[PDB]
Amino acid sequence: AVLSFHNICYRVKEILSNINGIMKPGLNAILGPTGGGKSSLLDVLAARKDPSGLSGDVLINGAPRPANFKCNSGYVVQDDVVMGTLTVRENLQFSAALRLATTMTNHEKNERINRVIQELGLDKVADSKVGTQFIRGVSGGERKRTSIGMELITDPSILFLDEPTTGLDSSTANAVLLLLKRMSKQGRTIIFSIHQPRYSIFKLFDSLTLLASGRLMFHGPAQEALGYFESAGYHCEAYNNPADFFLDIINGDLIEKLAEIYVNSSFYKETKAELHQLSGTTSFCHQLRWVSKRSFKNLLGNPQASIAQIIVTVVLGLVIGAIYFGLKNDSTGIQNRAGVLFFLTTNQCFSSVSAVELFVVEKKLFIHEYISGYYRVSSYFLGKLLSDLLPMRMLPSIIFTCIVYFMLGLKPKADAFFVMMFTLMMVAYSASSMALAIAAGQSVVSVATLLMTICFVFMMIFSGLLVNLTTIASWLSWLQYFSIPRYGFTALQHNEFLGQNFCPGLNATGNNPCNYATCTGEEYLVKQGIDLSPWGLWKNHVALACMIVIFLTIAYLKLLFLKKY
Amino acid sequence: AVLSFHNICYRVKEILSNINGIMKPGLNAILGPTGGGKSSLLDVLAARKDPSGLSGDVLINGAPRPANFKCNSGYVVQDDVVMGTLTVRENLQFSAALRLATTMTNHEKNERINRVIQELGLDKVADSKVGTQFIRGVSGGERKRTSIGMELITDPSILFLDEPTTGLDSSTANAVLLLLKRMSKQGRTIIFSIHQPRYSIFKLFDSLTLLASGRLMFHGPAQEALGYFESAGYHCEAYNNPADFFLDIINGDLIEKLAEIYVNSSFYKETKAELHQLSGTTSFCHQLRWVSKRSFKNLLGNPQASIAQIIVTVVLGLVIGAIYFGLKNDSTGIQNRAGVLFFLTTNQCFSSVSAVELFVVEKKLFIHEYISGYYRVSSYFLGKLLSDLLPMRMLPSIIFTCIVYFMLGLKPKADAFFVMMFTLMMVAYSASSMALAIAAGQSVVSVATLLMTICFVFMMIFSGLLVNLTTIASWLSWLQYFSIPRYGFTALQHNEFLGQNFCPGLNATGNNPCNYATCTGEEYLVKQGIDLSPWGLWKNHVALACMIVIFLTIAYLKLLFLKKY
Ligand SMILES: Cc1ccc(NC(=O)c2ccc(CN3CCN(C)CC3)cc2)cc1Nc1nccc(-c2cccnc2)n1
Ligand SMILES: CC(C)CCC[C@@H](C)[C@H]1CC[C@H]2[C@@H]3CC=C4C[C@@H](O)CC[C@]4(C)[C@H]3CC[C@]12C
Ligand SMILES: CC(C)CCC[C@@H](C)[C@H]1CC[C@H]2[C@@H]3CC=C4C[C@@H](O)CC[C@]4(C)[C@H]3CC[C@]12C
């Protein structure tokens, strides 16, 4: 194929202006400083910029662009979207399992990818972890071509690369481009935007589209690539870089002085002729099965934050298991259970600040994938929390009630012990479902951690311990239902002080003199304003279920309405 | 003033090796890549590297370095050390007020610095805020020139500049380079290390000392600056950068091939001739008066970290003031009073995370000023907390207990109001001192926060409310004394349960049947196990003062034993 664009303009102040470059198959390039449009019109061609400010017409061999054009062409980006704790043969496995595996069977995807790993120089390191900045692995010179093949699995026709060789250890930074030379001969239109090449590839190109000050510059066809500026007064000369002086008139030795050449130039007079010549979603249930495989294999591969909520949980169980040990039934038994039941509820809230890193640590990965048509939004959101949020906020609840229960000496039944295990694994979801809502769809975390714990302290006040709720008169008992650690703390106190006594040496079973005593259980709950009825126990657990579905929806309601551009 | 160094070696693996350069008065330079040794030998000549790993010698006009060599030579650095929210005239005033003017009075410093601001291009914007990243102001081309004049006040001999043009908006990047030429004509030996110049001032220098791979490289003299590489095979050619092709040898068109030409070059053999020829704390009381004037001015002009700790104090005072309001003396008066006293002492303890930014955010400021001999460490530390710690930890305490005391209805005495205002501003310093102890002398905040709020939860348990302390049996009750909000909570509970009744309609002054009642005040305190005597109240305050003196001391001790190099 062949790309072209005529009379392109754009606004957010008008950013770009009328440019009319052509783009033949081969190996193109975009040049210029960072302030110009070296990173702008790449997002115009690949349907990445917003179609509001776009005015001109961009063509693909005379025909206009299809309605599915962005999901057939690669967009290898600068910041690497390859997953860290994953195998390379597993990483290309994930790309092949979504874009093209609708009809071909499971021994047809593995022969197409072996055609790719036999390219790229990859068969030596084909079964290693790619490594992160935190864990050593495959070096940075070999991960950029690893991300190239992830969008080469489907058969493309344009590879919109996005400045590969920046911060890429220049001794082997050419190894990406000499690789790009040999793959360009098969009929691929490599269109990218390199960042400050010195001299070496200035002959090893096919067509430049240098831009400066975000306005306009040609030199579309370029193998001579320098002859346009040696007749304009401002000459690049002996002992001068050719690729740096061209934009040095804004660097201080006007750009309008070299802009005005193109009314009477040597390349504009032929390109307007051709540009005026030609002027006239699959298998939903397969998705969240395979999306579930990455986030689970990511957790096993990185055992530094996974065990970090297991050790600090079972250590904290033993400290509460050692401070409290054999709590008695004396006069200091009401206060001794009011604390240890308050600590288990509040720790299940405040240790759920670490769910902000479930969506915001890889927000750059998500927007690139959904715009490339891998999976639907609801398949990501129903699959992500089903794989990481559930089995990391459930097992650190049942270990944290199995250790503590037979060390304190609570009510030693069988059904009343499976409720305390149930309420902690329900309040920890309804605490984490709050953190998922005010985080998803952002870029930083230091405005969604100072905001969340400043709202988790206003929930800690109305909790039936520091207030004694049935004393605020009218206009501040309607904030009482908005606090998550209430409903866990009430249901934990309901099955705890039923049928117990705290006045040993006397008896008040049915003969109760001497008021202002609080020595039996069932009068203590009356004073704290909670119902003495078996419906009143399960009233909280149907409230947290409605607190989860409300909060989890407005996460998924805001993952749809985000700027996917 | 003339520098000379012969056969320098340096080990942390030896990074550096034998270098043989001579530095003439004029305007020198240091070139090369960032991974090499351009940023390494600047800290060797300017006495910033430690003299341990150094084996070679440096000479100032044949004499070695005196014991006071770093206290006459400025070290203008690449990241700015100018105070952001301060005016330029007072900023250069502070630089003059410490180094030289102990004998002259206050009408000689402005006589010298008016000559300085008449240079430098300062006479337009001499009286504004210089600004920072977060708050705007004077542009970057004027902020870097302010640091130059800041260490130009005392009459120097060498200005060891430290890569000025890093990220410095190239159209006026030559302006500071043009400014350095004119001041150098009067006996200023400028030694700096530029970062990738294009072509222009490469000829407008006096003596390069280009280096690469941290090993060695020559061209000491520089007036032709290119005549060496046209005789070495790897010739810099027409239409090629001369500034890069000298160091493009690290990219591979071998660096060591050029080093073998250095045993037979035209500059190795005559430089060894001369180097083998020539080889054969003031007014301490005045200091902390003036140091406190800066940081107090840094609170006035920056109303984003000062009034932010007043609004969240007074919007919290009403929320506490409205939840509890007119607390009674009936049977739910104990729990309703122990809550709000627990929430006041812990809120002063978790409001200590906002004081670890008091030393950490300006460590790069403190290291540069102490090695240049501005002030002693005991003047900086004792001058810091007098200005930024005292009037910002006390004023959000007495506004927090005045607005709530009559709002709740506590004991309406006169002296019992001056204990609650006193104890909260006594627990606040001891809380802020502990956050000063495990932060002072570090680089990142996110280690001294997840280590400190993991310790201020081990103090929130042993706090007289969630434990009922006389049940921890033997071997964890020795951990009872290591917790800061215990001492603030007991002394607040001591003067608030003394002399009241929580048993309306009955009376237990000397007639108390019906045990487990807690109808009087003094039965509640003995049930918690605190001393019911005027010694036990003031026992906590003398314990808190011993906590302050211990923690403030190790803040001062770990400031001394720091790697100031
Ligand atoms: C078990 C508990 C009970 C109460 C509290 N918090 C408070 O008692 C409290 C009091 C006042 C404020 C208000 N603060 C005022 C100033 N502004 C700026 C911020 C909020 C906040 C919290 C924390 C905890 N525990 C807790 N909190 C956070 C984290 C952890 C934790 C535990 C284990 C592993 N990792 C983290 N544990
Ligand atoms: C703004 C959003 C996030 C918070 C929504 C709070 C609401 C939805 C929560 C707080 C209190 C909860 C209610 C408390 C009482 C009951 C019991 C029963 O009669 C129906 C459910 C119902 C009515 C709960 C439904 C969910 C509930 C109404
Ligand atoms: C490193 C620090 C925090 C712990 C060291 C202990 C210091 C800080 C604290 C902990 C317990 C405190 C002691 C507890 C008991 C008393 C009461 C009286 O007899 C004199 C003060 C004295 C003796 C306190 C002095 C300060 C003290 C010793």
Numbering used by the authors:
A (entry chain A), B (entry chain B): 35 to 46, 61 to 301, 328 to 354, 370 to 654
Copy text from the publication.
ABCG2 transports uric acid and plays an essential role in the pathology of gout, but also confers resistance to a variety of chemotherapeutics including topoisomerase inhibitors (i.e., mitoxantrone (MXN), etoposide, topotecan, SN38), anthracyclines (i.e., doxorubicin and daunorubicin), antimetabolites (i.e., methotrexate and 5-fluorouracil), and photosensitizers (i.e., pheophorbide A). There are more than 200 known ABCG2 substrates which have highly diverse chemical structures and functions, and the substrate spectrum of ABCG2 is substantially overlapping with and yet distinct from that of Pgp or ABCC14. In this work, we used cryo-EM and biochemical assays to characterize the structures of ABCG2 in the unliganded state, and in the presence of the chemotherapeutic agents imatinib, MXN, or SN38. In total, our results delineate a new paradigm for the conformational transition cycle of ABCG2, and reveal how different chemotherapy compounds distinctively alter the conformational space of the transporter.
The structure of ABCG2 bound to imatinib was determined in the same fashion as the apo-closed conformation, except that the nanodisc reconstituted transporter was incubated with imatinib on ice for ~45 min before plunge freezing cryo-EM grids. Three-dimensional (3D) classification of ABCG2 particles bound to imatinib demonstrated a single predominant conformation with the TM helices in an inward open facing conformation. The inward open conformation observed in the presence of imatinib is essentially identical to the conformation seen previously with ABCG2 bound to 5D3 Fab fragments or high affinity inhibitors. The final cryo-EM structure of imatinib-bound ABCG2 at an overall resolution of 4.0 Å revealed one imatinib molecule bound in the inward-facing cavity between ABCG2 monomers. Imatinib bound in a location that spans across the top of the inward-facing cavity just beneath the leucine plug, similar to the previous binding position of the transport substrate E1S and the inhibitor MB136. Imatinib is sandwiched via π-stacking interactions between the Phe439 phenyl moiety from opposing ABCG2 monomers. Although bound in a similar location as previously seen with the inhibitor MB136, imatinib occupies significantly less volume at the dimer interface. Moreover, imatinib is bound relatively high in the inward facing cavity, whereas inhibitors such as MB136 and MZ29 extend farther towards the cytosol and make additional contacts with TM1. Although imatinib occupies a smaller volume and makes fewer protein contacts than other ABCG2 inhibitors, the molecule similarly acts like a wedge to force ABCG2 into the inward facing conformation and ultimately prevent ATP hydrolysis. Thus, in the presence of transport substrates MXN or SN38 a significant fraction of ABCG2 particles appear not to bind the substrates and remain in the apo-closed conformation.
